[PDB]
Design a protein around this ligand. Structure first.
Ligand SMILES: COc1ccc(OCc2ccc(COc3c(Cl)cccc3Cl)cc2)c(Cl)c1
Ligand SMILES: COc1ccc(OCc2ccc(COc3c(Cl)cccc3Cl)cc2)c(Cl)c1
Lengths: 262, 68, 272, 262, 68, 272
C-alpha cells in the first residue's frame, strides 16, 4: 500500500509501516553520465555497493522549542565509509541520493515536520560583509546546522564568526518559508506518517563537479506545527536521518584531499 | 528563406481579410548567421506541471484514497 | 503558451469517490477542478496562457546599469558586467536556479552641460569596448587598449537611435547558475588561514569581464557629463528549478539580508 | 468503501470518513411527477440547484440526560434560502430529501443514536382535548422539538399550551419505540460511525400537496444507548443536521404565504 | 506572405496601365506577429439597416397598409 | 463600404397600393425611394459609401492628451489614461454604446527654452513608461520604477519622427463600454453612509492605468519645458448600439450638463 515499503541498497535495508508514498524530485531518478553529456575524458570509478548504501547520520531531538535543522549534500556524507574516501581521492564526483527521514511518536502526540530538498541551498550569513561565511562553517558535515527564530548580526570585528544566520520564516535565505513547497518535499505529520522519503537525481549546471567545493542539495527540516503531547510541556522525540548515495562516479584521481577544519 | 506564420487575430475589422488570407499571416526572414541575432519566434510550447505538482513515486487517482 | 480545458457540465454525486479528501503529506498537490466539488455547466474555454510563457515573462528590456563618464580619470569608466546592480530583473531571474538564453543589449545615451550658461561642444561619439576577462584594461581614456583589434567595440554617435547588439549563450557551464552553494577554493589542512579562503557562493573572480566606456572626442574645458543606461533582454529562454521569490530587501550579491525582515502587514484572522 | 463517501448537490459537498453505508427509504430514489401521475395542469417550477442543495439546520447537543429530538419536513426547511421562497409562493409543492446527521466523538466515548425517517409522523398532544395541538406548535421550523421521559397533561384551562407531549418509549405516538425500526433508519453508534445518511423519496397518498398544511416526513433521533465518557459525568457532543431537498417542483403560483407564528 | 489587392482607380492617366495590370494593384506584407500591429485593410463590408429602420415583429410591405 | 442601387424608371400610377401613407407608431421608418412618389428615369448609380464605413469614420489620429514636463517634482509627469480629456474623439465614440478595436498611439514631442537669452542644453531623450493598474508609480524622476523590467517603455530622442506603438483590445469585458448605467458597489442595509458609496457610471477606479513621462538627461539649471501630445487612432473597429450625439457641452466624465443647454437658434416657422 502507500504506507508499507522496503528499500534495499547494497547491504542495507529500510522498512516502514507508515509511509505517505515517496517523492522522486522533479520526476527524475538518479542516473550515470551519458557519453553525449560526458566531459572529463578519463575512466570513472563507480564504487557501486561500497558507496551506494544507507548511511545513518546523527539523530537530532525535536522539542516544543525547536526551530529547524539543515544539512548539505555531499557534505553530510563526507566521512561516511568508502563514499567519503572516493569523494576525497577524486577531483570530480557525482551522485544522487535516497533521503529517508525517520520520526515516530504515538497517537496522542501532534506536530508536523516539513522536509524539503533544495538545489543550490544558499544560506544567509551573520555579518555586514557579503558572502563572508567561511568554508569550515558552511560545511558542518553530518551534524549539519539549525534554523533560528531571528536575525542576529555578528559585531565582533576582532574575531568575526563568519557563520550563517538562517532565520526560519525567511527560509534562511530571504524568501518566505511558506513558498518552500515549490521544492521537492514531504510532510511528517505525526497523526499520519513515520517518515519522509525523497529520491534526488543529480542536479547542477554541469554533468560533474567538485564535491568538496560545491554542495548540490540542501535538506531543510522545519516544524510546521510544533511538537505537543498529552500535557507534558516536556516532550522530546528523536529525528533520525538516513541517506544513501546513488550512481556514484568519480573522475580525476590523485592524492587525497584533507580539508582544513573548525 | 522566408518563414510565413499566421497571427492570432484579437480584434476583427469588418473585413473578410480579418478572417482569412495572407492578411492574417506575417512574414519573417533571418538576416544574420548567428542564431543569437535572431528575434524570439514566440511560438512557445507548454508542458505537464506534474514534475512539480505530483512528484510522487506511486501514482494516485484524485477520486481514490491518497493514503492507502 | 496554449489553451485551457473546457469546463464540462457536472451533476450531483453520492459515491465512494471522494476527490475533496486528500493527504498533502505525500508532497503532491490535489488536481481538483470545479466540477469535482460543485455542479458545473459546460463552458467552452477560450482563454490561453500565451503571455505567461517563460519567454514572454522575460521579453522586456530591463535596466541593469547606468555608466557615467565626465568629459570634464573620469574621461572613461569601467563597469564590471552583472545583473545584480539593479533589483527588478534580478528578482525575476531568481524565480529559477539555472537559465540558458541569448542576450540583447540596448544602450540609451544621454548627455548635458553642467553649466546653464557656460561652455560648448560639438556632437560626441562614444566607444563601448567589451573587455573579456584577461584582456588589458584601459589606464587612460586614450591608451593603446582602445585600438580594439580583437575586443568587440560599439561606436555610438550622440542623438542616433539607441545602440543594440546580441550576445550568444557565453557560459562555461551548460547553464547559468543563479545560485552556487559553494566556494572557488577548498582550504587545505595545514595552510595559513589567509590561504584557501574565498567568498561563499562565488565562482570566478571575473565571470564575464567588463565594459569600458569613453567619449572619443578631444575633451574641451567645458563641463559635461554623459550617462549610458544599459538595458538587457533575455531571448531564446530556458529555465530550470523554480524557487520562491525574494521577500525581503537584497543585501549584496548574495542571499544575505539585514533590513526589511518583516515584509507582511497585520490583518485580523477573522477580518475579511 | 462502505465508510468513505462524498455527496455533492448544487454548490454544496459533504465528505465523511466514517459512514455505515446509506439508506434509500423503501428502495425509492426521489423523482419528479410523471405525466401519467400528474394532477395540477399548470407548468411547474423546478428551482433545481437553487433549492436542491445542502442546508445546515441548528446544531443540538447530546448529554447523558437527553431524551431525543424530532423535526418535520418540509417544515424544518421553510426558512432555507430559495427553497423556502418557492414553498411559500406556491400553493402546491413536492420534494424528496437527503438527510445527513453528523456526530463525531472519540474512541473513549460510547452511545448510540437511532435516526428514523417516519412518513406521516403524527405526534401526541398534551390535553384531554383531541387533536388540540395548534399549527404554530406543530411546526417549530429548523429548531424542531424534543422527546420527553413521561406524559404530563396540560391542565391550564384558561391558557392551554396546545402543544405536543411526545413520550420517548412510546415513540411520541402510543406505539413502542423498539418497533420504530420498521421505518427507514440508521444507527450512529459512536464506536462505529460519524453519521447516518438517508435518501427519502416523496411519500404521500397524492402526487403533490400543500407544503404549508402538510408535513410528509418526520425525523426522530433517540439515544438508544446514552452518552458516556471516560469518567466525565459532564460530557456534551453536538449533533448537526444537514438536509438537502431533491427534485423540487411547485405548482399554483400566487402571492406569498405568510403564516401566523408563535 | 504577400497580399495583393486591387485599387479602385479614381482619376485615370492616359495609359492602359491606368485600366489594367499590376499597375492598378497594391501589395501588402505583415511584419509583426501581433494582429494589433497590422494596418487597417479597409476592405470593409456593409449590412442591412433593418435592425434599426424596421425592428418590427410582423414584417410589412410599403405598398400595403401598415395598420391592418 | 459599397455601391448604392440604381434608380429604375417609374411611370404614372393609379392603384390601391399607397406607399406614401404609413404609420410611424409601429416604430419603423418608411423605406421609400423616389420612384414611389414621382416618375423617375433610369440612373446608373456610381456613388458608394466607402468613406462612411465605421472604420473610415474613425481612421484619424485624434489628440487625447498634452502631457507637460519641466526639465526645470515636475522633472516627470503622470497622465491617467482616458479619451475624455478632449472632446472631439470622445463625441465620435459616443455615437455608440459599445466598441471593440485596437489602438495606435503616436506621440508628437515639442520643447523650447523658456528664456530667450539664457541657458543651453544637449538633445533630450524622453521615456514614456506605461504603468498598468497595480504597478508601482514613480515618486521621483529617477527612482527604481524607471528600470521598466516588465512595464513597456518608449524612449524617444528629440527631433526624431513621432514615436508610435500599437495596443491590442485590452478590455476585461468583451467590448469597451462608452456608457455604464451602474455602480462599482452596492450599499448594503445597515452599513454607514460612508460605506458602499461609489460614483455613478464608474467601473474600476483605475481602468487602464497611466503614463509616466520624464526626460532621461540630467537636468541643467536652464529653464526648459516639453510637451508630449498623445494621438490615438482606433483600428480594426466594431461598434454596437447607436445613440444620439452630444448636443450640449460636456461637463465632466459623465453625461452631466450645466452650461450650454440652449443649443438651437431661433428661426421662423414659415421662414425658408
Ligand atoms: C543569468 O543572467 C546573466 C548571465 C550573464 C550576463 O552577462 C554575460 C555577458 C557576457 C558578455 C557580455 C559582453 O557583451 C557585450 C559585447 Cl560582446 C560587446 C559590446 C557590449 C556588450 Cl554588453 C555581456 C554579458 C548577464 Cl547581464 C545576466
Ligand atoms: C473606448 O475607448 C477607449 C478605450 C480604451 C482606451 O485606453 C486603453 C489603453 C490601455 C493601455 C494603454 C497603454 O498603451 C501604451 C503602452 Cl502598452 C506603452 C506605451 C504607451 C502607451 Cl499609450 C493605452 C490605452 C482609450 Cl484611450 C479609449
Amino acid at each position: 500500500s502507500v504506507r508499507v515499503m522496503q528499500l534495499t541498497l547494497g547491504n542495507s535495508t529500510i522498512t516502514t509501516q507508515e509511509a505517505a508514498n515517496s517523492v522522486v524530485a522533479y520526476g527524475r531518478w538518479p542516473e550515470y553520465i551519458k557519453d553525449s553529456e560526458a566531459n572529463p575524458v578519463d575512466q570513472p570509478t563507480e564504487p557501486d555497493v561500497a558507496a551506494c548504501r544507507f548511511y545513518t547520520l546523527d539523530t537530532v531531538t525535536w522539542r516544543k522549542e525547536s526551530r529547524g535543522w539543515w544539512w548539505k549534500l555531499p557534505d553530510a556524507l563526507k566521512d561516511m565509509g568508502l563514499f567519503g574516501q572516493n569523494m576525497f581521492y577524486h577531483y570530480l564526483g557525482r551522485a544522487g541520493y535516497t533521503v529517508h527521514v525517520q520520526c515516530n511518536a504515538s497517537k496522542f502526540h501532534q506536530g508536523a515536520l516539513g522536509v524539503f530538498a533544495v538545489p543550490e541551498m544558499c544560506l544567509a550569513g551573520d555579518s555586514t560583509t557579503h558572502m563572508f561565511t567561511k568554508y569550515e562553517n558552511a560545511n558542518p558535515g553530518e551534524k549539519g546546522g539549525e534554523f533560528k527564530g531571528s536575525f542576529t548580526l555578528d559585531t565582533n570585528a576582532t574575531n568575526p564568526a563568519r557563520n550563517f544566520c538562517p532565520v526560519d520564516y525567511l527560509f534562511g535565505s530571504g524568501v518566505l518559508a511558506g513558498n518552500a513547497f515549490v521544492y521537492p518535499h514531504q510532510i511528517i505529520n505525526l497523526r499520519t506518517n513515520n517518515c519522509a522519503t525523497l529520491v534526488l537525481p543529480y542536479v547542477n549546471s554541469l554533468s560533474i563537479d567538485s564535491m568538496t567545493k560545491h554542495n548540490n542539495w540542501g535538506i531543510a527540516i522545519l516544524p510546521l506545527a510544533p511538537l505537543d503531547f498529552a500535557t507534558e510541556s516536556s516532550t522530546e522525540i528523536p529525528i533520525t536521518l538516513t541517506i544513501a548515495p546513488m550512481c556514484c562516479e568519480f573522475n580525476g584521481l590523485r592524492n587525497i584531499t584533507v580539508p582544513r577544519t573548525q | 528563406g522566408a518563414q510565413v506564420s499566421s497571427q492570432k487575430v484579437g480584434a476583427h475589422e469588418n473585413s473578410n481579410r480579418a478572417y482569412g488570407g495572407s492578411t492574417i499571416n506575417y512574414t519573417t526572414i533571418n538576416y544574420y548567421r548567428d542564431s543569437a541575432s535572431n528575434a524570439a519566434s514566440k511560438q512557445d510550447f507548454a508542458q505537464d506541471p506534474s514534475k512539480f505538482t505530483e512528484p510522487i513515486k506511486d501514482v494516485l487517482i484524485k477520486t481514490a484514497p491518497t493514503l492507502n | 503558451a496554449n489553451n485551457l480545458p473546457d469546463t464540462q457540465s457536472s451533476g450531483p454525486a453520492h459515491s465512494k469517490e471522494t476527490p475533496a479528501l486528500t493527504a498533502v503529506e505525500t508532497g503532491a498537490t490535489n488536481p481538483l477542478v470545479p466540477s469535482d466539488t460543485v455542479q458545473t455547466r459546460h463552458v467552452i474555454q477560450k482563454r490561453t496562457r500565451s503571455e505567461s510563457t517563460v519567454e514572454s515573462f522575460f521579453a522586456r528590456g530591463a535596466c541593469v546599469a547606468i555608466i557615467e563618464v565626465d568629459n570634464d580619470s573620469k574621461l572613461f569608466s569601467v563597469w564590471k558586467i552583472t545583473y545584480k546592480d539593479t533589483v527588478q530583473l534580478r528578482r525575476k531571474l531568481e524565480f529559477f536556479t539555472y537559465s540558458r538564453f541569448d542576450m540583447e543589449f540596448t544602450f540609451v545615451v544621454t548627455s548635458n552641460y553642467t553649466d546653464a550658461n557656460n561652455g560648448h561642444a560639438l556632437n560626441q561619439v562614444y566607444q563601448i569596448m567589451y573587455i573579456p576577462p584577461g584582456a588589458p584594461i584601459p589606464g587612460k581614456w586614450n591608451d593603446y587598449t582602445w585600438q580594439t583589434s580583437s575586443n568587440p567595440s560599439v561606436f555610438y554617435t550622440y542623438g542616433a537611435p539607441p545602440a543594440r547588439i546580441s550576445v550568444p549563450y557565453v557560459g562555461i557551464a551548460n547553464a547559468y547558475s543563479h545560485f552556487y552553494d559553494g566556494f572557488a577554493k577548498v582550504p587545505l589542512a595545514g595552510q595559513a588561514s589567509t590561504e584557501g579562503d574565498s567568498l561563499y557562493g562565488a565562482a570566478s573572480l571575473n565571470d564575464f569581464g567588463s565594459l569600458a566606456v569613453r567619449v572619443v572626442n578631444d575633451h574641451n574645458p567645458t563641463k559635461l557629463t554623459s550617462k549610458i543606461r544599459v538595458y538587457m533582454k533575455p531571448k531564446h529562454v530556458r529555465v530550470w528549478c523554480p524557487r520562491p521569490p525574494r521577500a525581503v530587501p537584497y543585501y549584496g550579491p548574495g542571499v544575505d539580508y539585514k533590513d526589511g525582515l518583516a515584509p507582511l502587514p497585520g490583518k485580523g484572522l477573522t477580518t475579511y
